[PDB]
Amino acid sequence: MQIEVTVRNITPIFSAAPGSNYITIDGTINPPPGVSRFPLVRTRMMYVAADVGDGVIKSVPLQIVPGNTMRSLLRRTMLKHVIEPALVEKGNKLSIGAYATAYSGNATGNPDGVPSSFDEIATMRAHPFIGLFGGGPRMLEGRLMVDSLYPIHTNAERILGAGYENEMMSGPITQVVWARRMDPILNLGSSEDVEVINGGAVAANGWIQDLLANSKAAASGRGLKAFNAHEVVIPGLKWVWRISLDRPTDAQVGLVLLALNKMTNERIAGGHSKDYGRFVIDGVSLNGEQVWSQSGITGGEQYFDAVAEAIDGLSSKEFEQFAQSA
Amino acid sequence: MQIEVTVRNITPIFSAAPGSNYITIDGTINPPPGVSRFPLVRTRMMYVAADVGDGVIKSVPLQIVPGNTMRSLLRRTMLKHVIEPALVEKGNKLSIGAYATAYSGNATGNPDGVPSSFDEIATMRAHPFIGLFGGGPRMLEGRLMVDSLYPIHTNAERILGAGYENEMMSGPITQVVWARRMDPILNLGSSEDVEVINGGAVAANGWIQDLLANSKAAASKKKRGLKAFNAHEVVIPGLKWVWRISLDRPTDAQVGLVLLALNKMTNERIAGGHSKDYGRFVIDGVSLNGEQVWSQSGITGGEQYFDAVAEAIDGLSSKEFEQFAQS
Amino acid sequence: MQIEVTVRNITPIFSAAPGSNYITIDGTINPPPGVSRFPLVRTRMMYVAADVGDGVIKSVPLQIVPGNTMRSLLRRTMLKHVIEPALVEKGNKLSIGAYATAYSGNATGNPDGVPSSFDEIATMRAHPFIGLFGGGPRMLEGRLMVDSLYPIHTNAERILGAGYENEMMSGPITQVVWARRMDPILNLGSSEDVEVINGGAVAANGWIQDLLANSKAGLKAFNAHEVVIPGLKWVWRISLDRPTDAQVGLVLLALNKMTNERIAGGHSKDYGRFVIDGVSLNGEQVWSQSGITGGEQYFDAVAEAIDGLSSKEFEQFAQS
Amino acid sequence: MQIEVTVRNITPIFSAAPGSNYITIDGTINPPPGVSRFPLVRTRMMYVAADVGDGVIKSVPLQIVPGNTMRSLLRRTMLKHVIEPALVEKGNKLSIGAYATAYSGNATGNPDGVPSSFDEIATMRAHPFIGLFGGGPRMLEGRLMVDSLYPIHTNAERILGAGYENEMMSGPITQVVWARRMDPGLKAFNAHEVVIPGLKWVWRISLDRPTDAQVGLVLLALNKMTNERIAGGHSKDYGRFVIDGVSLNGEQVWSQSGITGGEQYFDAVAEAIDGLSSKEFEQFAQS
Amino acid sequence: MQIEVTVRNITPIFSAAPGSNYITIDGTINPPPGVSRFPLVRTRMMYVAADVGDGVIKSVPLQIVPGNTMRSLLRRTMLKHVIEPALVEKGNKLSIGAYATAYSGNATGNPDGVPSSFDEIATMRAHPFIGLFGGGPRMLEGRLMVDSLYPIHTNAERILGAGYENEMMSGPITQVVWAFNAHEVVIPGLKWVWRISLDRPTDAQVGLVLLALNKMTNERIAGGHSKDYGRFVIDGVSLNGEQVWSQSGITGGEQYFDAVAEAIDGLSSKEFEQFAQSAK
Amino acid sequence: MRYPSDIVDQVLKAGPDKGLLTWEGVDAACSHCSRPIQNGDLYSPSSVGAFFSDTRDLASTSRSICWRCVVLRKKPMLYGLSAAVVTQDGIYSISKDVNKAWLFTTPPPAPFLVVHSSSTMQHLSWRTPVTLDNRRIHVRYGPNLFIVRPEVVRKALSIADRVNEGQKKWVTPVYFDRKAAAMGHGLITRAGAEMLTQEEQEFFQSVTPGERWALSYLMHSKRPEPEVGECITEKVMTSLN
Amino acid sequence: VNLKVTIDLSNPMMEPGDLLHLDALLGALRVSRARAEHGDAINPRDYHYDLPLERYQAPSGDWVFKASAFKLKRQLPNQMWMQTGRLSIVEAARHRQSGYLQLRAGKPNPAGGPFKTSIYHRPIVQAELTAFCVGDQQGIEALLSECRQIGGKRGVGFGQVAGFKVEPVAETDCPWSWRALPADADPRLVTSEHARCIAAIRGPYWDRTLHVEALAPTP
RNA sequence: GUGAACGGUGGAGCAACACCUGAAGGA
Ligand SMILES: [Zn+2]
Structure with missing residues (x-):
């Protein structure tokens, strides 16, 4: 389906990277031993092949938000605000296992050797929500694919070819900050x-x-009183996000559009206490055609009608039968 | 016939490798016992010979995509984007054995070997689709030859003799990505x-x-x-790969079918990791017998091949697949 | 639950950035070796993306007040002006560990990785004060999100939403001040x-x-420090996720007497002096010349909440 | 608790400014170097945002006397005419280190890292003299808050938010004056910029949870301090000033004879002076 | 300690100010057009905040004589009329460096950056003359403050309004003279006020100041001596707010006179040599 | 035994089943054993189940199975020959490590058949060639057909023992896999690189996979001495009949 | 002529489980060129014996070609390569629901069937190959120039040949007895490496119906 | 007629919660 959404952050973005690093007071990272150092936490980074100079092409570091995080955030946004209200308004309720499977994609982390029936697979892969995210016992595959969040930077010229030949930035992108806790x-x-x-x-x-x-x-112990530091991404950047679906039902794309339309008031990765991760959506494109406006989506009338009809018929038997094992 | 497809990936490529590997919190991999470790899954890697700067050969690893995966993906693209719409339009319906033979090339129809004749062998090897992949209970030889996906790297200098003096990657092309379950x-x-x-x-x-x-x-x-914490190795996105296809004395219809399959091949994913959208790629160039045929909107040229493949696709029926599967 | 506070400062603002810097007699900073070099400290600075050429965006500096500093200022104003009277007049006395956990997130250097039952989580999250600040042995989540203090400058056009096209200022907003000791x-x-x-x-x-x-x-000394000039507009953003009326009322109550305190840095020369000019609550200005007009529901709710406050929740929060 | 001291200068006032600048014989803003350039000493200057034009706020310059100078004047006068009489009549004898700690803050650099205890911190915060300024080897906090002396000028309207709506000067408040030390160094022609006399300045002082004795002592100190020079220029006798008004917590108390009110503070500090022991300063500055 | 002496001039007072100013046949000063330009020399000037327009404060010019010249005049008349005859009598010659130090402060252009001992500072600040005017190689601080000479004018009300509500003149006090070198001077027959202050002085120093004030009337204030500008007379000397002036001199404050007589009786040139000596 | 199925003719006693057919015309080979079926011979049409998947190992496309091949296909002895060696004097089990050591160090002097199963139940007996010389042993292990020379195994074991002399704890110079599927199969460890000459490395590199698979069982610290296998022919006979 | 052929290949190839014979490769190339010449419908066995090589004669028939088996010189350590096969459940599900696939079973049978997944592993080596043979040179060089790959699993792309060379060698330095020979072969040709085994000496070496008792060495 | 010929390592899951750099310095 290839929806492309461009956003802009208004607060710094932080996403911790596993490991340990040390920074000296002046600001060198990983100083040689023998000089005073303070613990540091670095944000997530990926290496992307890019042209340094004219023709010679090397791997360069880049700052991005993992696609796992973005996919989970999209799921929680579309689930907390739409599925739960339209579900609890009736007398319908989930089991504990049903809730765990709906949220985390699994119940206990143990697959079942026994497979499922063809009719069950074909029915679950047409559900408005289960078809988007497969999983649970006897793991199935959904028809939603989520990519990472890439800032529009010269280091990412090879990832994205055309449409952004301008408004591409260059130079340092991150900044270090400190804290004491007296x-x-x-x-x-x-x-x-x-x-x-x-x-x-x-x-x-x-x-x-x-x-x-x-x-x-x-x-x-x-x-x-201590002194620590961590690195973040400067605010005001422009990021591009790409989401794809293969052979989707109109209800599914309608639900995706709803989640995007209500994506606001959300924190992307981390720094919740310090208010990191606030952002504003300023572009949405459906198969190359812009379908976003300052008021909202204002498009996809067939998708919106289909998703409304689907959610009106939503019930809790499917979730219970999907989550249950044996 | 020689077709060379040069492509560029947009997203990391991940092909699971069957082995037991452990990594620490920091960069060091395969730690000695006595420290906290986590399971790791690495991409497919092959050891190749290297002759750079001198005459002695060194063994060097290189990350590649197996040719079997590429062949199966090409077969699936050719079936889904060409064969199935035409067969549905005609109304012909396949049996279970014919379906399995067409999609998997398995011999699980008549389990015992199927004796054949040179007339029917020639007829099926002249078929636009059956002769390309062969297979079946008869184990017919395939006219289509598929190579693995080779990145343009210095380690790959032995595989590619010349013509790539530029755009040669150096240094590592892999990185570890972590994931936790909450x-x-x-x-x-x-x-x-x-x-x-x-x-x-x-x-x-x-x-x-x-x-x-x-x-x-x-x-x-x-x-x-x-809750869990694991890591997996992927190939860095953005780099360039080369793919080689060949056919042994092919008809024009099969060549047109391959061209159409490529034109719809741009839509598919190279490898696993669908949820993370891995395997995404675009086609940067297509060379047919040393001649560049790829353009902005598609393959400009090869008119006789397109007319031949149109004539062939205007006449497919399921009875050929059935009689090929059952004999 | 979005709160936008528009303030002005009457005295220089000085937040000490970490790092060694040097200054000569002129305005050059960190000079090549050999020039008359004296120690210097500078104001806290953040890098932002800006359209300096209006065609290309790059990273440019801007002087701000850290979000953690103002979070601690808000917490201290909330605690020392409301909680202490309620505890002392009710006869409720607080232990040292719970005091530290109130003032600080934990009473020990290393936190304990043990979970708590859901009923406990819900009860402690419903708390008016403990709900806002989740600092505890179990690392409970808080309901409050605080932002850093931003000047209204053209460097931060992309950060401020809209409507600031008229009062936005340009030019350098910092100065160096010298001092000696004899x-x-x-x-x-x-x-x-x-x-x-x-x-x-x-x-x-x-x-x-x-x-x-x-x-x-050896008491003779001479050194400089960089401060922000007085008399410019600053903006503060605060947010709350699904809060009870008592928590909003408590935030507004702490804000109503906020003007008295000094922003951190430069106590001996009265640097953190500021005057609150406006308070917008979800797009409605509710600030008067003496306090908040409207929002009486939150005021009544927090007035009920302070009644019946007990120290039992604190010791049941901060133990081990 | 806002103490506001409105003052005026009888003589032109001048404060030394770091750095060296050159000036021509007549004006000539931004001249080519090497054209009748003479060294100039510039007075202290501070930037401030001003509403120069409708809808625009620009960082304009202004002339102030820094808060540190006035805080030091407070401390010096207070330690000169208040505690010293009690030290001489009672028969106390401060040590050299204690004297240095009293006059210039810390006794020496490299303070002891280890803290002492809450008891002595409380005693020093409750002291009439130690609490107001603090210092010492333990970096003890002070109770006083000193602001710089700001002239009442139209530019500083964004600082003087309320009041002073009249008597706001408009024109330039400085002037460049020339002086030659001819042979009766020797034979030197120089220039210097100095603020013009006869204009109103305002001083803001604050305290946190102040005791009555400390407020009374501070109020004794202002009266003693009326006869003092705020800035340098003893040879030129520059800084003679007259205190026009004093407002305590927003209400006026000053009169021609002096402050009119606060006898409770005065008697409290009077009894606080009685019983003063040199042991306080001795132990406070000892590490 | 807070001596305020009023004076009267009998001849025009001239104090040339550095700068370039132009006049056109006395009609105007610094015209925008470059027509009939002539060079003009101005007397020293001082801006003062004053009340004009009945409610608003503005900056207005005021003609003054700088305090540096008055301080130098005091130093020279006291050094010539009092210290010099007492020193030269009974021997007691001064060295050339001590002479330069006594007349102009320092003896050289470069001061040594070293400090001075506490005993030297204590003894020098007690000297009747050295304690008054500081200086020297180590830049000792004196205890004499000399203000400038202000005319008693309605423009200086914010400076001296309380003392003189009446007897304040108004209007221009400047006249331009052609002799073609044209300069402007302050008209004669005017009343000026001069303020001098001392901090913690001994009686000998105050006596020396009074002695210098007695013999000052024969000197001249600024001006061009060839054109006999700058003559003045002294009246109305007030010491600490009390009138101590008569037609025949001070005739008051006898303790200061006795103390200065005793002090200048025993002056010696050893202190001058010790003060002027540079320990570089 | 020219053909493998000869086992059921000679090693064990059995006859043609009841319900088979008779062959006429031009002869054809058994689709499993690849032995010609002559006129008057007992044969059955090929009717293997849907679970059959060894179409690649079929020797002929005649779709006819001789009675000896049919007896070979019987389920009851499929799990009775999971790991076995069949000689003219009967069958023996090679599941034990000592049995493998005996077979690969001091092999019997008669033609035999060596079958080892890599799963619970799979057809192996009818697709393994019968060896005629003791110097070149044929072993069928799952879908793999290995050729093992006992003298090369003995030489490699002697080299390992020689290099392990003078050490307090036994260490294997080369890592080998019993499953014979890991990527480290046939690769020399760092210790082996440090204490063996390059000629030893070349010799270890140039052994066929059968030698590596056989060495994996015995080239370890707990060295098993060769021991004769257990005769289980009577149990197989009573299970089948 | 008693010449020798050496082959170097850039791509690693499959490791043969049995001896790879030069005459077999030449016969495969001859069959390919016959198919290219006389159309596709051609009997493979009518042309595969037409090769420019001499024939040795055993005392009782059993003629074999003079060409010997290939010898390997390893440049890299052997590496295991894993492959697997399976049929997609999801696409079959969609097709069955849409009627494109006629299937009535509720779910795949766990005991086996079309949807069972299989996995296998095989060795992989990169080496220098050498062989000795007696016969004409020009035909051999033409046939070798026609070839493009060598080894098994050629469809996947293994064993792409980089180059080849054919040169005459002395009669004492051309050992062609390292081969599969009949049981009644002259003992002069038979060495200690040869052993008695059931194998093929001629034609398609994978046809089990033509296997006979013979003498062959271990690869 | 290369002990050839036939065979896709694939599906699912958030790195993060709490933390004030400041106390005292010019005639
Ligand atoms: Zn058989």
């Missing part, structure tokens, strides 16, 4: 502010003596 | 979140208690859970 | 002065001898 007690110096503490001055002095005891022991 | 129940945070389960808080609390009991059982037995 | 003993200049301190003139001469010895083989 100890409140050491900030306490006034008696009228310690009346809440049980014991007051005696308890405070006991804790301070505990701190000196800890410091004496360590030089021979961890201090509240 | 637990949707642990993310519940309010009664409105649990208003969809059979029972409210009690069932979720019982799920917690069962999970914690299993956790204690695991922590006692060694001294299931949804 | 030794009092060198400025005695009178006999009675030296005799007032112990030892007298001989003591002053001995201290000068010690200073000479130190110079041959």
Whole structure:
């Protein structure tokens, strides 16, 4: 089906990468041993083949959001706001296993050797929701494919050929930030502010003596006051996202359009406390033709009617029969 | 006949390799026992000979796509985009044995070997589709020859003799991608979140208690859970590959069929990892017997081949497949 | 639940960015070696994508106030101005560990990776204050999302949504300020002065001898710092996900007396002084010259909520 | 608690500014280098956003006296005429290190890393003199908040949000003055820029949870400080000023004789002075 | 300590100001058109905030004599009329460096960056003359503040309004003279006010100031001595707000006079040599 | 035994089944054993089940199975010959490691048949050639047909023992797989590279897969001494009949 | 002429489980060229013996070609290659629901059938190949120039040949007895490597109906 | 008539929760 959606972030994007790195105070990453270093957390990165210079082509690092995360976010968006309201409005409810299978795509993580029937497969792959995301026991395949989120950068020239020959950026994209998390007690110096503490001055002095005891022991668990850093992506960038479906039902593409139309007020990857991942959708293209406007989708009338009809007929027997094993 | 297709991938390529591999949290792979490790799945890699800068040969690994996968994908594209629409339009319906023979090339029709005659052998080898892939209970020889997908890399210098002095990749072309499976129940945070389960808080609390009991059982037995952490190796996206096809004394109809299959081949996915949209690619060039025929809108040229394939596709019937499967 | 706060500052704003920097007599910063080089500190800075040429977007600097700093400021204003009176007047006293978990996320250096039953999660999430800040031993999620403080500058056109095309300012919005420190003993200049301190003139001469010895083989100092000029507009964005009315009321209550506090950095010279100009709540301005007009439902809900507050939830939250 | 001191200058005022600039004999803004250039010492300047044109806000310059200078003047006057009499009549004898700690903040660099205890922190925060400024080897926080002295000018309207709607100067408030030390260094022709006299400036001071004794001592200090020079130029006798008005927590108290009110603060600081021991400063600055 | 002395001029006062200004046959000053331009020399000037328009504050010009020249005049008259005859009597010659140090502050152009001992500062700040005017190689700070000479004019009300509500003149106080080198001067018969301050002074220093003020009337203020500009007379000297002036001199504050008599009785040239010496 | 099916004629005792047919005209070969069916011989038309998938191993397309081939196809002894060696004196089991060591180090001096099963139940007996010399053994292991020379195995084992002399713990110079499916099959470990000359490496590289598969069973630390296999012919006879 | 042929191949090829004979490759090439010449409907066995090679004669018939089996020189260690086969359940499901596939069974039978999945592994080597033969040179060089691949699994693309060379060698340096020979072969040709086995000495070596007792060495 | 010829390693699953760089310096 090949829907292409271009978005823009208005807060920094952060997606932790497994491992450990250290940064010196001035800002070199992975300094040689013998110099002071602080723990660092780096954002997700992929290597993409690109032309450095004129003709010589090397692998260059790029900043992207994993497609697993984006697919899971799309699922939760389309499921929390549409399936749950239209489901609980009736007396229909799911089992615990049905809920787990609907959300995580599986119930317990154990496949079943016994296969399923052809009619069951053909019926489940035509469901508005189950057909989009396969899984569960006796794993099936859905007809939704989700790609990663690529910023429109010169390093990604070979990934995307035409349509973006301009408004392509270059240069550094990430920035490092720091945090301390100080100890409140050491900030306490006034008696009228310690009346809440049980014991007051005696308890405070006991804790301070505990701190000196800890410091004496360590030089021979961890201090509240520290200093750490992590790296994020600068705001204001333009990202492109591509989603594909093979031979889809009109209800399925309608549901995808609904999820896109209500994609707002969402956090992409992480940094929820610090408000990372806020974004604004500013472009949607359906098979090459723009179908987005400042008010909304304002298109896909046949898809919208089909998805409305499908959700009106939605029920909870299919989810229970799909999630159940043996 | 020699067809060379030069393509460029947009998304990482992932072809599962059958082996047991473990990786640590950091970059180092295959750690010695004594440190925390996680299972890993790597792409298909082949050791090849290298002669660069000197005369002594060195053994070097190279990531490739197996030719069997490419042949099967080409067969599936040819069937789905050409054979099935025409057979449905005519109204002809295939039997189970004919379907299995056409799609899998298996001999699971008449299990015993099928004796044939040179007249019928020649007729089926002249068929636009059956003669291309052969197979069946008769095990007819195939007129179509498919090579593996070779990236344009320095390690691949032995496979390609010349004409690629440029666009040669160097250094590693693979990277490890991680994935964790979470637990949707642990993310519940309010009664409105649990208003969809059979029972409210009690069932979720019982799920917690069962999970914690299993956790204690695991922590006692060694001294299931949804959450997990694994990694898998993929080929970096964006690079260029070359593919070689040949035919042994082919008719024009088969060549036109191959050309049409390529024209619809741009739609398909190279390899596994459908959910992550891996295997996506575009065609950058098609050379027919050393002549460039690929263009912006498709294959400009080869008119006799197109008329021959149109004449052939205007006359397919299922009875040929049936009589080929059953003899 | 979106809150947009438009503020103005009356004094220089100084947030100390980590890193060593050097300054000469002129405006060049981090000079080539050999020039008169003195230590410097600069304001916190973030890189943003901007249309400097209006045809090409690139990364340009902009001075901001970190989101974590203002999150801590909001939490401290909420706690020390509301929670403490409610606990003291009800006779409820709080332990040290729960106090630390209130002030800080945890009472210990290393968190414990053990889950909690769903009923506990729901109860602690329904809490008015603990709901907003999820810092605890089990790493509970919070209901509050806080953003960094942004000036209204053309560098951040792509960040601000719309309607700011008129009041947006340009040009550099930062300055360098110099300061020096001198030794009092060198400025005695009178006999009675030296005799007032112990030892007298001989003591002053001995201290000068010690200073000479130190110079041959120390309170004089000279250094600068970079601050943001006063009198410009700043914007703050806060959001809440599915909150109860009590939590919104508590946020508004903390905001109603927010103007009194000082933004972090430069306490001794009164730097963090600011005046709140407007408060928009989902697109409706609800700020008056003395406080919030409207939203009485949240006010009544939080007024009910503060009644019946107990410390039992804190000790049942922060234990192990 | 906002203390507002409205002052005026009898003599032109001038503050030394870091850096060196050159100037021609008459004006000549942006001249070619090497044309009658003479060294110039520039007064301290601070940028501020101003509504120069309708809908546009520009960073314009202005002339101020920095807050650190006035905080140091406060401390010096206060330690000169208040605590010193109590030290001389009672018979106290501060140490050299304690004296340096009292006058210029920290006694020495490289402070002791280890903290001491809450008890002595509380005592020093409750001290009339130590609490207001703090310092010491333990980086003790202060209670005072000093703002720089801002002239009442149309540019600073965005700083003077409320009040002072009149007597807002409009024209330039500075002037370049020439001086030659001829032979009666020696024989030097120089220039210097100085603020014109006879214009109103405002001083803002604040405190957090202040005790009555500390407020009373600060109020004694302003009266003692009326006879002092805010900026350098003792040879030129530059900075003579007269305190016009004092507003305490937004309400006016100043009169011709002096402050009119706060006798409770005055008597509280008076009894706080009694019983003052040199031991406080001795232990406070000891590590 | 806060001495305020009013003076009257009997001849025009001239204090040339650096710069370039033009006049056109006395008609106008600095015309936009370059027609009939002639060079003009202006007297020293001082902008002061004043009340004009009955409610608004503006900057207006005011003709003054700079405080640097007044401080130098005080130094020179005190050094010539008092210190010099007492020093030269009974021997006590000065070295050339000490002479230059006493007349112009430093003796050279480069000051040594070293500090000075506490005893030297204590003894120098107590000297009747060295303690008054500081300076020297190590840049000692004196305890004498000299303001500039202001006319008692309605423009200077925000500077000296409280003291003189009446007896304030108004209007221009400047006249342009052709002799073709044209310059502007302050008209004679005008009343000026001069403010001098000292911080923590001994009685000898105040006595020396009063002695210098007695003999100052025969000197000249700025001006061109060839054109006999700058003559003045002294009246109305007030010490700490109290009137201590008579037609025959001060006649008041006898303790200062006794102290200065004793101090200048025992002055010696050793202190001058010690102060002027540079320990580079 | 010229043809494999001869086993059921000689090693065990059986006769033609009841219900078979008679052949006339030009002779044809058994589609399994590839032995000609002459006039008057007992044969059955090919009627294998739908689970049959060894069409690639069929020797002829005559769709006729001789009675000996039919007896070979019987299920009851399919699991009785999962791992066996058949000689003129009967059948023996090679499932035990010591039996494999005996077969591959001191083989019997008579023509035999060596069958090893890689699954629970599959047809192996009728598609393995019968060996006539003891120097070149034919072994059928699943879909693989291996040729094993016992002298090469003995030489490799002697080299391994020689290189393992002087060490406190036994270490295998080369890694081999019993399943014979891993990518590390037939690859020399780092220790073997360090303590063997290049000639040893070339010799180890140039062995046919049968040698590697046979060595995988015995070229390990717990060295099994050769031991004669267990005679199980009577159990097979009583199970079939 | 007693000449020798050497072949180098760029692509790694399948490792043969039995001896690969030069005359077999030449016969395959001859059959291919006969098909190219006399049309497609041609009996393979009428032309495969027409080769430019001499024939040895055993005392009782059993003539074999002089060409010997190929010898391998390994350049890389052997590597296992895995392949598998299966039929897609989903596409069959869609076709059966649409009526394009006539099937009545409810689900695939676990005991076997068309939908069973299979997996197999085979060795792979990259080497230098050498052979000795007696016969004319020009025909041999033409036939070899016609060839493009060597080994098994040619449809997948294994064993692409890079080049070949044919050169005359001395009579004492052309051992062609390293081959499959009849049981009654002269003992002079038979060496210690030869062993008695059931194998094919001529024609299609994969036809089990023509296998006879003979003497052959292990590959 | 290369111990040839026939055979797709595939489906499913979020890396993240909580954290203030600041205390004191010019006539
Ligand atoms: Zn048979």
